[PDB]
Amino acid sequence: IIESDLERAEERAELSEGKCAELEEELKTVTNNLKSLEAQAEKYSQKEDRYEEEIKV
């Protein structure tokens, strides 16, 4: 019974670990996108200025 609950609890660990890994992969994907977007938001803010400068010029 404990083993059956263990198997299910372990299954939950696996399902939850599955989700954990999936979220981790999504976390990293999103975080990697965050980072590319941090780079883009800054490059874009810089472009906001390069373009603003092209307008000023």
Partner 1 sequence: DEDETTALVCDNGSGLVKAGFAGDDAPRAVFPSIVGRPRHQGVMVGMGQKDSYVGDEAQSKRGILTLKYPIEHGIITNWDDMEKIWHHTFYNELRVAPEEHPTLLTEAPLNPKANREKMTQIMFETFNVPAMYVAIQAVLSLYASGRTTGIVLDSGDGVTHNVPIYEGYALPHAIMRLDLAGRDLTDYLMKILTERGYSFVTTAEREIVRDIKEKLCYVALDFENEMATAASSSSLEKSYELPDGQVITIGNERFRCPETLFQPSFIGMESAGIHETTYNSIMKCDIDIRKDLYANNVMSGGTTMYPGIADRMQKEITALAPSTMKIKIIAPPERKYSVWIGGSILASLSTFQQMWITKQEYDEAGPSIVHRKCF
Which residues would be at the binding site for partner 1 (CB under 8 A)?
25, 28-29, 36
Residues 15-34 that bind a copy of itself (CB under 8 A): 15-17, 19-20, 22-24, 26-27, 30-31, 33-34
Q: Terminal CA-to-CA distance of the chain, rounded, Å?
A: 78
Distance CA 15, CA 21 (A): 10
- Read off φ and ψ for residue 17, nearest 5 degrees: -75, -35
Write out the residues near a copy of itself by the rule CB under 8 A. Answer: 2-3, 5-7, 9-10, 12-17, 19-20, 22-24, 26-27, 30-31, 33-34, 37-38, 40-41, 44-45, 47-48, 51-52, 54-55
